[PDB]
Amino acid sequence: KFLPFQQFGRDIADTTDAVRDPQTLEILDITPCSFGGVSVITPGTNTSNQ
Amino acid sequence: KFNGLTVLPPLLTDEMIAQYTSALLAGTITSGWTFGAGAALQIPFAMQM
Numbered sequence A: 001k002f003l004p005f006q007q008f009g010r011d012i013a014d015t016t017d018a019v020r021d022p023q024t025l026e027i028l029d030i031t032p033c034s035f036g037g038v039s040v041i042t043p044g045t046n047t048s049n050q
Numbered sequence B: 001k002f003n004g005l006t007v008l009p010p011l012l013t014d015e016m017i018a019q020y021t022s023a024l025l026a027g028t029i030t031s032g033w034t035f036g037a038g039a040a041l042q043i044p045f046a047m048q049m
């Protein structure tokens, strides 16, 4: 919920949190895209390759 | 978690740790202390006291 004059919420430390939009009045929310650190598990390459 | 920080879960869950602690307690209460050297033996608790 926003006050009738509140925009550009940070709300944790510095991140641009849920923000309103122009041309309309809705409290949109911004979430970072999915990310992760991939890893590879392998047996001895002298044995196989899968 | 958003920016760049990730946390990895531990290899052994809490249930496994509880199982090890239960096994140690069960060994101590009946086997005495022979299972700390070799095979587990049995002996009444009063004799161990």
Ligand SMILES: *[C@@H]1O[C@H](CO)[C@@H](O)[C@H](O)[C@H]1NC(C)=O
Pocket (backbone or CB within 6 Å): A023, A024
């Ligand atoms: C913006 O202009 C469009 C085009 O007519 C109109 O439909 C809309 O209601 C306007 N919105 C605002 C907030 O002025």
Ligand SMILES: *[C@@H]1O[C@H](CO)[C@@H](O)[C@H](O)[C@H]1NC(C)=O
Pocket (backbone or CB within 6 Å): A046, A047
């Ligand atoms: C394992 O590696 C050694 C040398 O790195 C190789 O001589 C041996 O053939 C390998 N094992 C198999 C099953 O190929």
